[PDB]
Design a protein around this ligand. Structure first.
Ligand code: ATP
Ligand code: ATP
Ligand code: ATP
Ligand code: CA
Ligand code: ZN
Ligand code: ZN
Ligand code: ZN
Lengths: 162, 204, 228, 122
């Protein structure tokens, strides 16, 4: 009809992990319902309330607070990335603000001057042209590419600003 | 102090009773910083959580008063002896029942009271009582105890982000931003390594 | 007068950049774009534009320059591939194979769930007709065969359109197991909604980004259960 | 007096979706309660715990973390929009701080010179 769980600490652990966590009130929902005229009733009350308040309100809610915090972190980092992508220049990292009242707007600085795909095309040209026919700038950039230097890229300074 | 306590627990387990090595597992909170950060989210605004618990206890006390005065015949509890007892014969028993069997339920104390009959004169009172308990002490208060934790998580994340960006962007000594060292002979990655090396000041 | 047609053709193959000379002064290099620069796929451009990650400074070039060589290799491979007409025709239609495979997996799973004690509407009608005529078992067998062939085509397109490949070969393994070993192995194929969707992948990322936090909290719960 | 659900896979799915998702402990709260001496007792324990920990603590909590995150996103977006409305000029998009210590303040630069309704009238 009915069995006893605690005849061994392993069975107690299994019962309190299976029937305790999987309940809205903790292991106090499976334990024999006590009688107020018993000598262990305060002990049972404290036991059940402690389980409920520690392992079902603070420890089974951190597994979810962590998820919420991760959601917030993902949104924040994605917003930062999107703002950086849609505002600053990819190559020189210059804000969209600096190209107001200038002759060339930011919508052109990225499309004509600092087009990163133009830099990729230049790199491919430098590594597809025979070394003898390099002009000045091409041999210069080939030299730096051999030196594993990245200075020849613009850095926080466009040329349409001066 | 924590390490000497660990030694004390180890010696107790070795000599007093083998059932003391359990407390040693509370080194996982010390050997790990992530779990420690979670426990920090729990225990940073600990006073908020404790005061919300006291508020829940006050509300339970008021509901127990109401039940004892009016609904004391509906507080009937099943028991397994070695058939059904009455809880409310004393306000202390009402408080104990509504705090143990009322907070530990998905629908409030209304899940333990005697199930009423539609043809009773106290039925609207019981409906309002159960719904008020469920909506005030189980959807709001026991949910504030968790909203506090969530807000603490957010606060810790924002504080750590601020600290880390300060550390990785501005100089430690002069507090001078990274952007100031653009288009200059010395780069920020060099200004912090040779000129304003905070360990050279310690050496001096 | 130089504005635009020979002039349009030359302006379409003339790229200018602003390299920084050694003396901290900028120049404006104007060069023809090599031929293989016409083969860089748009999807690759979008991927490198979005996924590229800032380094310690606000500089995304330190990774773009690193990926330059791989982009050149892909450029050459595309040049080589466009000659091959059949494989190129497959490669152009790559989302089609994925959609067909996912739809077949979903239909197979629905048929299994509803029957197993033992133009989309047009495709649904075709499956219903097959069920009515041949019955379950042969309909399931032919659906699995089509799924396996479509996934083989998808994988050959994927390699020809060069951990994700590991996922695709695992999908192939599951498909063959379902076709031959036991028809209840198509259930795992439904774990493509995560790969075929970015939003579901984002929520799963929210779950599995701080996975160590969740696992350590679970171990804390286990310790508390042990003490109680 | 007691019917059987799993005579077919569809019925198992219906039972575990109706009686499993709608319980605070997963499908283990409807399955026959097993005797500790059974051979499948560890299997049942693992089954119930996995259901509870995957489909009732994570997924049914993702369905709510998404709502919370959407709340946060809405609040941030609305704060941004309101601050832009109350700080920068509608037409020129010029910050409020630029009109400090100037002969004319922002409080009337948006009421006399850059009144967008004057542009509509024009
Ligand atoms: N440095 C940069 N900063 C910002 N955006 C950039 C940068 N380099 C390239 N882009 C963007 O990346 C894409 C590359 O443009 P591309 O040369 O491929 O133009 P396209 O294929 O003719 O198309 P379209 O000009 O219509 O977008 C464009 O969106 C361009 O705005
Ligand atoms: N004022 C500062 N602001 C920021 N970072 C600083 C500052 N002073 C020192 N650091 C950083 O603290 C660490 C101190 O390094 P240290 O001077 O001991 O050199 P090191 O032992 O040879 O190692 P490393 O290879 O990191 O330079 C380095 O990361 C340095 O960048
Ligand atoms: N460019 C702008 N920037 C900011 N606020 C603006 C701008 N143009 C109009 N407004 C605001 O829109 C509303 C337009 O005011 P309007 O010229 O219609 O005056 P009104 O209806 O007589 O009201 P009142 O003078 O009492 O504000 C005002 O709130 C004005 O502050
Ligand atoms: Ca030469
Ligand atoms: Zn630029
Ligand atoms: Zn400094
Ligand atoms: Zn204005």
């Amino acid at each position: 009809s009915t069995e006893r769980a605690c005849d061994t600490l392993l069975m107690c652990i299994v019962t309190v992990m299976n029937h305790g966590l999987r309940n809205g009130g903790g292991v106090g929902d499976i334990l024999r319902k006590p009688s107020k005229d018993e000598s262990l009733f305060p002990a049972r009350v404290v036991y059940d309330l402690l389980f409920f308040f520690i392992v079902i309100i603070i420890v089974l809610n951190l597994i979810f607070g962590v998820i919420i915090d991760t959601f917030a972190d993902l949104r924040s980092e994605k917003q930062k990335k999107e703002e950086i992508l849609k505002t600053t220049c990819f190559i020189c990292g210059l804000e969209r603000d600096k190209f107001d009242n200038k002759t060339v707007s930011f919508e052109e600085h990225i499309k004509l001057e600092h087009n990163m795909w133009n830099y990729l095309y230049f790199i491919v040209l430098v590594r597809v042209k025979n070394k003898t026919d390099y002009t000045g700038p091409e041999s210069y950039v080939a030299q730096m590419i051999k030196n594993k230097n990245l200075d020849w890229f613009p850095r926080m300074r466009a040329m349409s600003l001066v | 102090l924590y390490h000497v306590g660990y030694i004390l627990t180890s010696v107790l387990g070795l000599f007093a009773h083998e059932l003391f090595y359990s407390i040693l597992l509370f080194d996982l909170i010390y050997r790990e910083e992530t779990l420690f950060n979670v426990i920090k989210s729990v225990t940073r605004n600990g006073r908020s959580i404790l005061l919300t618990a006291l508020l829940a206890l006050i509300l339970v006390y008021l509901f127990s008063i109401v039940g004892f005065l009016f609904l004391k015949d509906d507080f009937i509890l099943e028991v397994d002896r070695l058939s059904t007892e009455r809880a409310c014969d004393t306000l202390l028993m009402c408080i104990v029942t509504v705090m143990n069997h009322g907070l530990r339920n998905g629908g409030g104390v209304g899940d333990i009271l005697r199930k009423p009959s539609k043809d009773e004169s106290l039925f609207p009172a019981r409906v309002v009582y159960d719904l008020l308990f469920f909506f005030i002490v189980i959807i709001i208060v026991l949910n504030l105890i968790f909203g506090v934790i969530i807000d603490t998580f957010a606060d810790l994340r924002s504080e750590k982000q601020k600290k880390e960006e300060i550390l990785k962007t501005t100089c430690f000594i002069c507090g001078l931003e990274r952007d100031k060292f653009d288009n200059k002979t010395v780069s920020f990655e060099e200004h912090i390594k040779l000129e304003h090396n905070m360990w050279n000041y310690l050496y001096f | 007068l130089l504005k635009p047609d020979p002039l349009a053709y030359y302006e379409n193959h003339t790229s200018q950049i602003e390299i920084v000379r050694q003396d901290r002064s900028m120049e404006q290099i104007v060069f023809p774009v090599p031929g293989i620069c016409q083969f860089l796929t748009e999807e690759t451009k979008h991927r490198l534009f979005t996924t590229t990650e800032q380094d310690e400074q606000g500089s995304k070039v330190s990774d773009f320059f690193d990926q330059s060589s791989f982009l050149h290799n892909e450029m050459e491979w595309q040049r080589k591939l466009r000659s091959m007409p059949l494989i190129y025709w497959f490669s152009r239609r790559m989302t089609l194979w994925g959609s067909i495979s996912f739809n077949l997996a979903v239909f197979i799973n629905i048929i299994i769930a509803f029957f197993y004690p033992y133009i989309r509407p047009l495709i649904v009608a075709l499956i219903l007709r097959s069920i009515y005529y041949l019955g379950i078992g042969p309909t399931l067998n032919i659906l699995g065969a089509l799924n396996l062939t479509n996934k083989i085509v998808f994988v050959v397109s994927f390699v020809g359109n060069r951990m994700e490949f590991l996922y695709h070969v695992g999908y192939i393994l599951t498909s063959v197991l379902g076709l031959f070993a036991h028809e209840l192995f198509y259930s795992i194929l439904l774990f493509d909604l995560i790969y075929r969707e970015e939003t579901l992948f984002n929520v799963i990322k929210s779950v599995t980004r701080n996975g160590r936090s969740i696992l350590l909290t679970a171990l804390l719960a286990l310790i508390l259960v042990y003490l109680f």
